[PDB]
Amino acid sequence: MKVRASVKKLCRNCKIVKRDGVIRVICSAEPKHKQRQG
Amino acid sequence: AEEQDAAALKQLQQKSYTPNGRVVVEGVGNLMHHIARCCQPIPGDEIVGFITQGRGISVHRADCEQLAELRSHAPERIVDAVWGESYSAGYSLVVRVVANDRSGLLRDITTILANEKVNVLGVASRSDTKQQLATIDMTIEIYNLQVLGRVLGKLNQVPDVIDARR
Amino acid sequence: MFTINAEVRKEQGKGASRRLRAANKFPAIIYGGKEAPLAIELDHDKVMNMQAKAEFYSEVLTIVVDGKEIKVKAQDVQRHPYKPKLQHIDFVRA
Amino acid sequence: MALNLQDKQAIVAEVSEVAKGALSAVVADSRGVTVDKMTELRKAGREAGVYMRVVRNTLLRRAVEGTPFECLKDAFVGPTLIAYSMEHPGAAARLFKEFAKANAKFEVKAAAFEGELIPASQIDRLATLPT
Amino acid sequence: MLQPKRTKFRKMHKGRNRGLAQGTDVSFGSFGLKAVGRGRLTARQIEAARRAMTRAVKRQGKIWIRVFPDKPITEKPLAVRMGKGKGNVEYWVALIQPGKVLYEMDGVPEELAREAFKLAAAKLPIKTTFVTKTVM
Amino acid sequence: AKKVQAYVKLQVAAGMANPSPPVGPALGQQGVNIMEFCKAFNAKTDSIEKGLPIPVVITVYADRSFTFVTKTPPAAVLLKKAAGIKSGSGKPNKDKVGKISRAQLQEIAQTKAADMTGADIEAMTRSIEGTARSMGLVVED
RNA sequence: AGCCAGGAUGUUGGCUUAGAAGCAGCCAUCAUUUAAAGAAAGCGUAAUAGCUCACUGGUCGAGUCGGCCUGCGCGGAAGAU
Ligand SMILES: [Mg+2]
Ligand SMILES: [Mg+2]
Ligand SMILES: [Mg+2]
Ligand SMILES: [Zn+2]
Ligand SMILES: [Zn+2]
């Protein structure tokens, strides 16, 4: 889990999603890519 | 800093280094000649020799601008020819290498130039103020066109080098 | 080619202009030839849309105002400094 | 895909083709190949040239839209994957059974070779043709 | 770094940065990086931006740097009290109003240019928006 | 006719029997032996000409040997002895290296017509021309 | 948008390289059979191969796509009795 001010779709398989009012990149293709806003 | 040091060392080395079948003009070998610096033919796509008043003949490489001018002025001094038997040494390649100047690019370039079997006769060097573009002309000596090509390729391979030509 | 709908301004001045801008309009003016200058408002968005093309700038445009199809070329435009907007337009009659 | 005009043009072309012809057949490459594309197309080429379009575009409002103009019975073929093959030279040519043959010799399926229209026929392996 | 080669005066007053820019249009190039945000671009920042954008483009197509850091900003050293005259010029700045086109760019695709200007924008301390060479 | 089992076009000049440096591991990657590409390979090669690369289908079945049918050599190697110059691309538009006429190209085309997947010969000819252009030879129409 | 197929031929375009076969890169970047298929967008190989994509036809039956405009909001946002 990266936790950034800036979360971004790092590939096409990266998907932005808001959970508990928290922007999160979640990616099936690469688990490095998964992020959080914090 | 290390890179800079390396570059300096390379330069020093170059300096230290610095410190007749060749061209058969028109079916008669052993003619007093020399390669012109306007464009320096090796195994080039044909050559032409301007019969000078002093210092014999100046070989120009065929389809040169200076040579064309000379022809226009007076055609009778010019003589078309073959590139002889290929002189054992076959010297004279100036290679202009344009590159983006970071802290340790020139050094890298120098390093790459070394190791390869090339006699570095001179290295002209400057950083252009139009951007931060390091530009360098290596007066080098080598035995074939293929070899030159290989060298060029190698130079290119160092990714900071933008373009490398004569 | 381009039919622009214009209305004559009852109030001219800085404040008036500002107000117009706020209400999604903007002041323009027509001039040229023997006729007097005619200061109008223009509905902004439409004008903006029109002026995305160079056709608009080149060609003669029809400003309709009080039932008069005035044939004018756009002469000079004041764009807003840091926003995709139009402060004001000048129109020369062709 | 391009708007209105191109499609219309295509339709017109199709209609024209239909007008200059008679016998036809169907094919559905649900799991075909571009190698198997170059059997039917190749055959067509051999026969004459480019004219014979496979025109795979069997929409309810595209190829079926042009059907009211010439030969109304083809509207029922519309649904599912289909490619209409119109024939020009020779009245009732050999191209009807060709498809069937292809299907037989490795092409998964061929729209159940139901055929098109000469006596308003249906799924029949008609060997009787001019030869 | 961009800096005046010679000057009348070494030290300049703070002044103020109220108003909008004059250099508002994309004069030279095709695309422009227009400062929406008011502020002051230091020379260094500008240089960085240039590097970003040139790099981005890969030296394909020409770039302009419309703003020039012509105003010397002074500072006092640490553990220095308030009197003792005005401090020395540490760096040079360009006062940017809203509207100032900062960089222009041509000889590239639009998208590429935009990308370049994103990078450039990151470098800069002021909010910047993409603009185009408008007819008239 | 089955789909992709292990068929690939990969060999140098047909005259060069048993190519170990160029192909080597590639031709004997699967259970097919190195001995198959010399005796059987040069059987069909002697019927036409040597010194030209010609492709062939290598559908490797489980039962030792494989079925094969040779096709046609490329215009690439053809445009050297027939064309003239043996070089090509690098600087095509900046300066013309070589050039061929249309008639010659056309002539070249119809000999390959067995392998080509074309309806009309004209089409084939134009394809050939295009290829030539790509290679770096401006056609003299 | 899901779902089902194809995504070929000249061709391993040439060249340049040690090799380069859409894919170290460099340069042309065409035509063909075409419903459509880039001398190839990404992965992938020592290079081939292989796997996705663009593009295509069905399948399905209503809107969908992405700017730029501003309104309010979210994160960015950790301290001491
Ligand atoms: Mg939780
Ligand atoms: Mg006031
Ligand atoms: Mg907040
Ligand atoms: Zn990802
Ligand atoms: Zn010369």
E interface residues, C as partner, C-beta within 8 Å = 20-21, 24-25, 34-36, 97-99, 129, 134-136
HSE, side-chain direction, 13 A CA sphere, residue F137: 27
- Number of Cβ within a 10 Å radius of residue C85: 13
3-class state of residue C37 by DSSP: coil
Q: What is the CA radius of gyration of chain B?
A: 18
Cα E52 from Cα D99, distance rounded (Å): 61
Chains interfacing with B (3 or more CB pairs < 8 Å): E
Domains observed in chain F: 7-71 (3.30.1550.10), 72-140 (1.10.10.250)
Nearest residue to B97 via CA among B114, B83, B109: B109
Nearest residue to B7 via CA among B151, B93, B136: B136
User: What DSSP state is assigned to residue E77?
Assistant: P
3-class state of residue A37 by DSSP: strand
Cα E100 from Cα E37, distance rounded (Å): 9
- Give yes or no for a contact between B87 and B81, defined as CB atoms under 8 angstroms apart: no
Show me where the domains of chain E are located.
21-136
Nearest residue to E114 via CA among E126, E125, E103: E103
Q: Which ligand sits closest to the CA of A21? A: 1
Q: Are strands C38-43 and C25-31 parallel, antiparallel or unpaired?
A: antiparallel
- Ranges of H-type helices in D1-131: 4-19, 34-47, 95-104
Report CA-CA distances (Å) from E26 to A30, C83, E31, E55, F128: 42, 14, 7, 21, 48
Residue D46 beta carbon within 7 A of nucleic strand G: no
Nearest residue to D33 via CA among D95, D105, D86: D105
At the fourth CATH level, which superfamily is domain D1-130?
A: Ribosomal protein L10, N-terminal RNA-binding domain (3.30.70.1730)
Cα B90 from Cα B105, distance rounded (Å): 29
Q: Which ligand sits closest to the CA of C17? A: 2
Exposed (0-12), middle (13-18) or buried (19+): which is F4, by Cβ within 10 Å?
exposed
Q: What is the four-CA torsion angle of D53, D56, D57, D60, rounded to 10 degrees?
A: 110
Show me where the domains of chain D are located.
1-130
Give the CATH number of domain C1-94: 2.40.240.10
Give the CATH number of domain E21-136: 3.90.1170.10
User: What DSSP state is assigned to residue F44?
Assistant: H
Report CA-CA distances (Å) from E63 to B138, B151, E96, F75: 30, 33, 19, 45
- Give yes or no for a contact between F67 and F59, defined as CB atoms under 8 angstroms apart: yes
Residue F135 beta carbon within 7 A of nucleic strand G: yes
Does B131 contact E at CB distance below 8 Å?
A: yes
Q: Which residues pair with C31 in a beta bridge?
A: C92
Q: Are strands C3-8 and C61-64 parallel, antiparallel or unpaired?
A: parallel
Residue F89 beta carbon within 7 A of nucleic strand G: yes
Q: Which of C53, C56, C75, C82 to mutate to test the interface with E (most CBs of E within 10 A)?
A: C82
Residue F87 beta carbon within 7 A of nucleic strand G: yes
Where is C40: in which H helix or E strand? strand C38-43
Please identify residues in chain D, positions 12-31, with a C-beta within 7 angstroms of any atom of strand G: 29-31
Way the structure was solved: cryo-EM
- Ranges of H-type helices in D21-112: 34-47, 95-104
